[PDB]
Write a protein that binds this DNA or RNA. Structure first.
Ligand SMILES: [K+]
Ligand SMILES: [K+]
Ligand SMILES: [Mg+2]
Ligand SMILES: [Mg+2]
Ligand SMILES: [Zn+2]
Ligand SMILES: [Zn+2]
Lengths: 468, 468
DNA sequence: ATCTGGCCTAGATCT
DNA sequence: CACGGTGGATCGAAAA
DNA sequence: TTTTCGATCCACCGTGAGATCTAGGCCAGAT
DNA sequence: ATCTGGCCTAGATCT
DNA sequence: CACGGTGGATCGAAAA
DNA sequence: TTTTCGATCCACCGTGAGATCTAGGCCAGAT
């Protein structure tokens, strides 16, 4: 009937960041100027705004939180993606999988102390191993689906609780159904900040490995993220700690503390290396930690690997192995896809050269996972393990929330303001809606060392400054 | 050629409060959706945006201020008003007068301490004594033309200086010219806050009157506002002070301080009346003033006349005269047009009854002007002497400035940010452009005493809460 | 065993 | 510190 | 030889996220 | 005439 | 304190 | 008996303007 369907009038209503009064006056002005058939009435705008929303028996909002039963959220997603983005019957019976990735990160608000929001972005819709739907910008806020949030300060406690709830809700849900098609789901946990990577990674450094219980007895459990968390998520901290053991034990060619005369000299070396690091680069190190195991910021681990030569000279760990750790962690943290066989052989040779540089000191668990069993988990998931919003992207999504809380919710009962935040965080995410953020500025790419670009593939949609 | 002329695409661009990127994406999206002939290109948007701007040899912006030579501003105004809002040759030679009113008021910003902006709103365009153009909402920010501003704290000093500059620039300018029509100008100063009314009114209470040098020798000088300022602008303060003299002299039936035994009892009465007022209503009074003549806030004068009965009992001034002062000041402050003969006879009878209530105390100068020569100045100007933005209106105009400073200027050299503020404060004012603010809420009208509504005419465009 | 007394975490302030 | 966002200046292609 | 059209520049000011400094509640020496 | 000492104006905080 | 601004709920007219 | 259309409601949260409280520089009693 009209030029703009409701499904595109909505896209306009979002991209221009328009209020209800603003859209109503826009359409009314276009009408008054003689043209009559361009902008759907708000009635239809909202009648599509409803098909963007899940069944209201599943959206549970309270004055403190808003939770969408993941089942309904995934049903909604796989319904919208079809409803517009596939010419139907392109496949008749081929299996469908909506490969998606989720997570959360608190962000202060400058009461509403700091939002803490689970989040979900549909990455791809694959059929029988073939692509039907691809996300044009997997690090852009275009497709951030909210699963739940609540205005609680992001302690370790609220994080561990929310992760427990969400990781059981994930195990629960059943494949979704749309127009005679039975779509299964695959969710990974990669929307993790650094702080949260510490809060979750610091359960304990456990002395085991599942595959190694050399040969393999193939039995795998990929779910609940524990594999990815322990192996590669923001292992950097552990790595800086792990090697540091050697940086102290550099005297007696062993790990234990049972020796006589080993321990006093070992303590003194810890002393002097900590004094050296404190005087040359002013970075606090493991020397002060009493709770939940030895732990440091991501600040210290990053600034450790931030320059290979300087700290490599400092610690006495010869510069080449620190070069290798810096480059492989640069690969993980980079945000680009990991080429399986090249990264795998780089890691295998790094392992070989490392063990033949230090064989007295056996393989530390976290590093043993990162290097030996490292690449095959990027393989079995085909993921970007750091995959999460860019600096400009997370900045835009947090400004999205602050806008939808301050300008696009209704200042009533408080059940409603959170209800509208949740609404617009679905609408603005709808895989069905065209949505145009202003064009980014071309930034010089993240300066990378001379041995990583072969591990990455720089045909890219990302432009972050300090992380990715 | 296209549905929206540039002159209406601009109206849309403003009313929706749209940025340049937002308008460009709006038009581009409408284009991409198949319709091609609706939204002018930004090139034409801006080519009309130029005809909204005065000749750039007159806009003088510096890192501290922005001043438009009033001549150019009035030329621009009388050009735009014709260019769209008159079917030409409706009159061929009849004289033209753009009756306008101006003023200023500082407003803090919550560096950019507080803007202090001259302002101008074209009220009417009259021809040979007949209306051609009428302002639909003379208290709305729709037509606020900026003459100059500068980010300076609003002392009495900057105000008196800016008023001197503007009142000489007004005397200077020459009738404007548009398409064979020679338009003269008439500007009044009514865009005055209360604070500014004090800062200007407190030159001195001078012992004279021009008409009275009983009969009249007709010689009049209406310009420079001095008449309106001294006579009726926010005289209320003076009135509360003037009568207060009697409220002290209630003992000896005279004005002077030469008596013996008069003065001590007079001081004691001042004491006790000040103690009574301080204990019953907690309002500070004239008793403490050492500089620039006796002066009080508008707070105290208003709260004085805020209830007739209570303070009327307190002061000993019989309640009826205070009823009359309250009602006539309510008329001035009300914001509604003043019916000349009814208001005039009300004031004449108030004068008669007052002098026959207190004749010992001669007519104080400010009150003598307000009541005896009072109405004829509303006559010779046909004005709303309080005419100035409403609460919601001034709130919207100050939010206009904060928006055009924070969102619609360019963050460059600072010559430019002020240049764009000035631009959009002209554009958003253009008498040529349709501009739709969101619809106001119906408020209960300002509660008025039972003898004023005959002085006002409540066929109204105004909806303020505390002032008008 | 008490009396205050040098440290380990949240707000405030850089960058 | 880094980046986003301002609206005009400027330039080249194009329209013609 | 004019207008129109689009992209890019200009360059700084807020903002904001991460990252550093600064104030109050708890296990060792003397009675 | 000096030495500090009770008041009259700007920022901060209600409403 | 007062008012503006939120987007949906609800209702009546209307479309038909 | 459905959809569509418009206006009005819901009612509270920021904001903001005016209006109140709170900290530093100047003319009288003793040397
Ligand atoms: K940032
Ligand atoms: K107000
Ligand atoms: Mg975080
Ligand atoms: Mg003012
Ligand atoms: Zn293993
Ligand atoms: Zn007179």
């Amino acid at each position: 009937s009209t030029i703009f369907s409701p499904e595109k009038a909505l896209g306009l209503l979002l991209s221009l960041k328009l209020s209800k009064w603003q859209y109503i006056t826009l359409r009314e002005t276009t009408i008054r100027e003689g043209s009559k058939e361009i902008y759907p009435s708000y009635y239809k705008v909202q009648k599509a705004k409803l098909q963007c929303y899940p069944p209201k028996a599943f959206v549970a909002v309270t004055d403190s939180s808003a939770k969408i039963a993941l089942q309904a959220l995934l049903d909604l997603t796989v319904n919208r993606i079809f409803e517009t983005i596939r010419s139907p019957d392109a496949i008749q019976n081929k299996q469908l999988i909506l490969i998606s990735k989720w997570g959360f990160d608190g962000a202060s608000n400058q009461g509403d102390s700091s939002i803490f929001m689970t989040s979900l972005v549909p990455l791809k819709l694959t059929a029988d191993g073939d692509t039907v739907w691809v996300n044009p910008k997997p690090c852009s806020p275009m497709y951030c689906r909210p699963v739940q949030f609540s205005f609680v300060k992001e302690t370790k406690d609220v994080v561990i609780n929310e992760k427990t709830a969400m990781d059981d809700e994930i195990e629960a849900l059943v494949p979704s159904k749309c127009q005679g098609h039975e779509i299964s789901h695959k969710l990974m946990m990669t929307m993790i900040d650094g702080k949260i990577c510490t809060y979750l990674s610091e359960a304990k450094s456990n002395a085991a490995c599942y595959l190694c219980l050399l040969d393999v007895i193939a039995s795998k459990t990929i779910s609940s993220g524990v594999y990815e968390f322990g192996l590669s998520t923001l292992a950097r901290i552990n790595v800086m700690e792990c090697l540091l053991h050697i940086a102290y034990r550099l005297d007696f060619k062993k790990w234990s503390a049972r020796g006589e005369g080993h321990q006093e000299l070992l303590h003194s070396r810890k002393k002097l290396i900590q004094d050296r690091f404190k005087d040359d680069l002013n970075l606090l190190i493991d020397i002060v930690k009493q709770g939940s195991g030895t732990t440091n910021d991501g600040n210290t681990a990053r600034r450790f690997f931030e320059f290979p030569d300087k700290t490599a000279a400092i610690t006495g760990l010869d510069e080449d192995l620190i070069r290798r750790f810096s480059v492989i962690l640069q690969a993980i943290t980079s945000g680009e896809i990991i080429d399986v066989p090249k990264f795998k052989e780089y890691a295998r040779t790094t392992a070989e050269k490392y063990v033949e540089l230090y064989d007295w000191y056996y393989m530390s668990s976290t590093v043993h996972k990162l290097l030996i069993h490292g690449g095959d988990i990027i393989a079995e998931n085909a993921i970007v393990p750091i995959g999460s919003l860019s600096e400009e992207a997370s900045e835009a999504r947090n400004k999205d929330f602050r806008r939808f809380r301050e300008h696009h919710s209704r200042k009533k009962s408080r059940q409603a303001s959170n209800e509208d935040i949740l609404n617009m965080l679905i609408i603005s995410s709808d895989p069905l809606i065209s949505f145009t953020r202003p064009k980014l500025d071309a930034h010089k790419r993240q300066t990378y060392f001379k041995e990583t670009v072969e591990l990455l593939q720089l045909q890219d949609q990302e432009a972050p400054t300090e992380f990715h």
